Structure 1
Amino acid sequence: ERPTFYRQELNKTIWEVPERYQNLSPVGSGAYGSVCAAFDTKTGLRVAVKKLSRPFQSIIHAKRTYRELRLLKHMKHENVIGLLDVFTPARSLEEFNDVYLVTHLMGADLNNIVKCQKLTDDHVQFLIYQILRGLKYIHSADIIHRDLKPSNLAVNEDCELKILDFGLVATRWYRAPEIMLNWMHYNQTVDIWSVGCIMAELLTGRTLFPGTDHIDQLKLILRLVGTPGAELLKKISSESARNYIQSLTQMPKMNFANVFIGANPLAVDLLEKMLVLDSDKRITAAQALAHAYFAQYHDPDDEPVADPYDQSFESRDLLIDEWKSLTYDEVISFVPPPLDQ
C-alpha cells in the first residue's frame, strides 16, 4: 500500500518523498540528478536520496533512467552503491514523470579527501583494496564502469568505501589512453587504469596525469608509460592514430621506482601492473586482490562475484513510452533488502 508523501522545494527543485524520510538536506548534483541527505525513520540510518532530472525527456534520458535503475537494483555488494528504496509520487503510469533512488549515506567522496592531503600507505591499501573488491564484483557481471574518478568513490568516517554509479576534477585525468585514442573495443581494464591513477594520487598528493585536453592527456600518459612497443602498434587498426602515435618522439617506459620515490615498493609494483600501456597486459581486479600489497586484507572467500546481469536492453531501440513503462515496472517490482545489524 502507498505511504504518505510530502512536498518541499530545495534549491529550486521540488522534492516529493514519503514521510519515512525526514530532514532532507541538499548535498549536491551530478549531471543526471540532485541528491539530498535524509534521515530514514524506518531504520534510523542516514540515507542519500537522488531525484533523477527529466528522466523521460528523450529516448536517451529514458534509456539512461532505465539503465540506472536496473544497475542499482542489481548491485548487491559491500563496496558498490545499491538500493535501499526506489519510489515515485506517481500513482499511475501516465502520472509517472519522477524517479527517486535511495542508498545508505556514506557522506564524503575521495575528491573531498585527496584535496590538501597526501595519505599514508596503510590507508591507501585499505581504500584501493575496497575499490578492487567492488570492481571484481562489477566486472564479473560483465559491466565496465568507464568513469572511475575520486568523486565516484563514496567514503564514510570509517574509511569504508563504495563505488558510485555517478558522483557529485577533470574526468579525462583518470581515463585510459586507449579511450583518449577513441578505440571502440576497450575492455574492463580501462577501470584498472583509473584505479592506478587514483592510487598514484593518494600516495603522492598530485594528479598523475593532469591533461588540459585529450591530446595533452595522451602525451602525459606516454611520457610515464612509454610510446607503444611493436606488439601494441600492430593492434592499432586506425591509420591516422598510428601515423600520429608513430610520429611522436618515441619514449621509454619510466622506472616507476624512480617516479614514486618514497612509496612502499609493493605499491610501486602494483602501479606498474595497473598502468601497463597495452590493456591486454594490465592486471585484472581479481588478480590485483591477490597481489602482496593487499596481504593484510585479502580473503579469497570474502571477495564475491555478481549474479548474472542482463544488458541486452542496451542494444534495443524503443519508444520513450516503452522505456518509461519498463522503468515503472522496475520501480513497482522493487524488493528492499532486509534489515540486519
Structure 2
Amino acid sequence: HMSQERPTFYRQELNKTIWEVPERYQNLSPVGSGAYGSVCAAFDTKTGHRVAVKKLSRPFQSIIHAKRTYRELRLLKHMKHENVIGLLDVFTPARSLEEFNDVYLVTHLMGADLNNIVKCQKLTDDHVQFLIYQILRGLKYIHSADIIHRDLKPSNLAVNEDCELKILDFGLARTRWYRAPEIMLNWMHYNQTVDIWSVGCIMAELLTGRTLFPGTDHIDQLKLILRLVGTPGAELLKKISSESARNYIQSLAQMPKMNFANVFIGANPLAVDLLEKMLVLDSDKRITAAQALAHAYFAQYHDPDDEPVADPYDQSFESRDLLIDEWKSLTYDEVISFVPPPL
C-alpha cells in the first residue's frame, strides 16, 4: 500500500558474489570486503554522485547477524545531519518476505579520509578548526540521540576538496590509538564522552603531525596515556567496576598530569586549551560535544542556531529476544518504510 514502484534490477558477478541492483546504479567497482559485507563504488544516475553500495553477506544466517543488520538499518535511517553518514537508499531484489535474503545499503562514498588529506598537504590552523568543528557538530547531533560512535579515527572521517567532513562507519558490535582508556581495558560502561577522547587524539595529531599515543599493546598504550594525563585519582578509582583493573592501576607508580603547553609549543593556545578539556582521564569531566562547540577555538565557525540536535532514537529493540525470522521481518519492514532524502 503506497509502496515505491520497484525499479528494474540487473545482475552482475563482481569478485565472489552476484550483485543485483537497480539500473539507477552503474559502473560498480569493488572497493573491498569487510567481515559483515562487501562494498562497491557506483555512479548514482538519479543524483549524479558516486556512492558506496554495501551488499550484506548472509545478514539472516543467525540471531547475531539478523539483529546486527536490523541495528545498522535503524541507525542509518535515523541519522540526518550534514556531518554524519546518511542512508541514501536501501533495496532488495526480493518482491516478498519469503524471498528476502539480501540487503544493499547505499551511503556517502569515501572519496578521501582524513589520512588522505594529511598525506597530500599541510593543514592550516583554519583547516584544523573547521575539521574539528564539523566532527564536534556531528557528535553533538548523534550524542543528543544517545548514539555513541565508539570508533572515531581518521579512517572513519570522509573529507571532500571543500574540507567538508562526514562521520562514517559507526560501531555496530554489542588500531587502539584513538580509544578511551576506560573502554580499551573495559574499566566501565561506554559513555558518549569516549568519542570526545577520540576527537582529542585526532586533533593533537592534526596539530603536531604525530600520532599522540601510538602504543603497540594495551599496556604500552595505557602507560603512554597515563604519562600525559596522570594516573587515576581516588575519585576515578571508585568508578572502576573490576577489582583486578583497580588493583592493576594501584600497582602503577603515581604520575602527575603533564603541562600540555610544554608538549604542544607553537600550537594555537586555544587549541591546546581545548585539547586539555578533551583528554581528561575521568570521562565524567571531559568537555561534551555541545560545550566544545562554544570554545573560543571555534569562534570563526560557531553558530548556535545551526548546530542542530536529533530526534530521540528508540533503542529498546536492543533488549528484545527474537527469532532470526522475526529480526529478518523487522529488517524487511524498515526496507519497506524507507523514505529517500529529498533532492
Q: Specify if TM > 0.5.
A: yes
Structure 1 CA distance for aligned equivalents of residues 184 and 122 of structure 2: 28
Which residue in 2 is equivalent to 1:334? 338
Q: Which moved more, 1:278-287 or 1:216-225?
A: 216-225
Deviation at residue 32 of structure 1 after TM alignment: 2.4
- 1:268 equivalent in alignment to 2:282: no
In structure 2, relative to structure 1, the CA distance for the partners of 1:29 and 1:208 (3 Å cut) is farther
Deviation at residue 118 of structure 1 after TM alignment: 4.9
Structure 2 CA distance for aligned equivalents of residues 105 and 57 of structure 1: 27
In structure 2, relative to structure 1, the CA distance for the partners of 1:87 and 1:169 (3 Å cut) is closer
The normalised TM-score by structure 2 is 0.94
In structure 2, relative to structure 1, the CA distance for the partners of 1:34 and 1:262 (3 Å cut) is farther
Is the CA contact (8 Å cut-off) linking 1:78 and 1:162 kept in structure 2? yes
Deviation at residue 166 of structure 1 after TM alignment: 4.4
Structure 1 CA distance for aligned equivalents of residues 121 and 253 of structure 2: 35
Deviation at residue 319 of structure 1 after TM alignment: 0.9
Q: Which moved more, 1:49-58 or 1:277-286?
A: 49-58
Is the CA contact (8 Å cut-off) linking 2:188 and 2:239 kept in structure 1? no
Is the CA contact (8 Å cut-off) linking 1:47 and 1:104 kept in structure 2? yes
Q: Which moved more, 1:75-84 or 1:174-183?
A: 174-183
SS at match of 2:186: coil
Structure 2 CA distance for aligned equivalents of residues 82 and 258 of structure 1: 41
Deviation at residue 254 of structure 1 after TM alignment: 1.0
Deviation at residue 184 of structure 1 after TM alignment: 3.4
Is the CA contact (8 Å cut-off) linking 1:152 and 1:167 kept in structure 2? no
Structure 2 CA distance for aligned equivalents of residues 104 and 144 of structure 1: 20
Q: Which moved more, 1:169-178 or 1:152-161?
A: 169-178
Structure 1 CA distance for aligned equivalents of residues 57 and 230 of structure 2: 42
Structure 1 CA distance for aligned equivalents of residues 300 and 64 of structure 2: 44
In structure 2, relative to structure 1, the CA distance for the partners of 1:171 and 1:315 (3 Å cut) is farther
Structure 2 CA distance for aligned equivalents of residues 326 and 84 of structure 1: 20
Deviation at residue 231 of structure 1 after TM alignment: 2.2
Deviations 1:17-45 (A, max 9, x none): 10011111222334322222211111222
Provide structure 1 residue ranges, at least 5 long, that are not aligned to the other structure: none
Question: Which of 226, 233, 243 is the equivalent residue of 2:247?
Answer: 243
Deviation at residue 250 of structure 1 after TM alignment: 1.5
Q: Which moved more, 1:44-53 or 1:26-35?
A: 26-35
Deviation at residue 9 of structure 1 after TM alignment: 1.9
In structure 2, relative to structure 1, the CA distance for the partners of 1:314 and 1:169 (3 Å cut) is closer
- 1:118 equivalent in alignment to 2:122: yes
Structure 2 CA distance for aligned equivalents of residues 14 and 283 of structure 1: 47
SS at match of 2:61: coil
Q: Which moved more, 1:85-94 or 1:279-288?
A: 85-94
The normalised TM-score by structure 1 is 0.94
- Aligned residue pairs total 339
The percent identity for this pair of structures is 99
Structure 2 CA distance for aligned equivalents of residues 125 and 29 of structure 1: 34
Q: Which moved more, 1:227-236 or 1:265-274?
A: 227-236
Provide structure 2 residue ranges, at least 5 long, that are not aligned to the other structure: none
Deviation at residue 49 of structure 1 after TM alignment: 1.2
In structure 2, relative to structure 1, the CA distance for the partners of 1:209 and 1:296 (3 Å cut) is same
Is the CA contact (8 Å cut-off) linking 1:114 and 1:201 kept in structure 2? no
- Runs (4+) off by over 4 Å: 115-118, 166-170
SS at match of 1:115: helix
Deviation at residue 218 of structure 1 after TM alignment: 1.3
Q: Which moved more, 1:292-301 or 1:259-268?
A: 259-268
Q: Which moved more, 1:289-298 or 1:235-244?
A: 235-244
Is the CA contact (8 Å cut-off) linking 1:55 and 1:61 kept in structure 2? yes
Deviation at residue 167 of structure 1 after TM alignment: 9.3
In structure 2, relative to structure 1, the CA distance for the partners of 1:117 and 1:317 (3 Å cut) is farther
Is the CA contact (8 Å cut-off) linking 1:30 and 1:166 kept in structure 2? no
Deviation at residue 16 of structure 1 after TM alignment: 1.2
Q: How large is the RMSD of aligned CA atoms in angstroms?
A: 2.3
Deviations 1:51-100 (A, max 9, x none): 11221121111111000000000000000011111101112212111111
In structure 2, relative to structure 1, the CA distance for the partners of 1:167 and 1:338 (3 Å cut) is same
Deviations 1:106-143 (A, max 9, x none): 51112333347653211111111100000000000011
Which residue in 1 is equivalent to 2:75? 71
Structure 2 CA distance for aligned equivalents of residues 315 and 117 of structure 1: 47
Structure 2 CA distance for aligned equivalents of residues 45 and 19 of structure 1: 15
In structure 2, relative to structure 1, the CA distance for the partners of 1:191 and 1:167 (3 Å cut) is closer
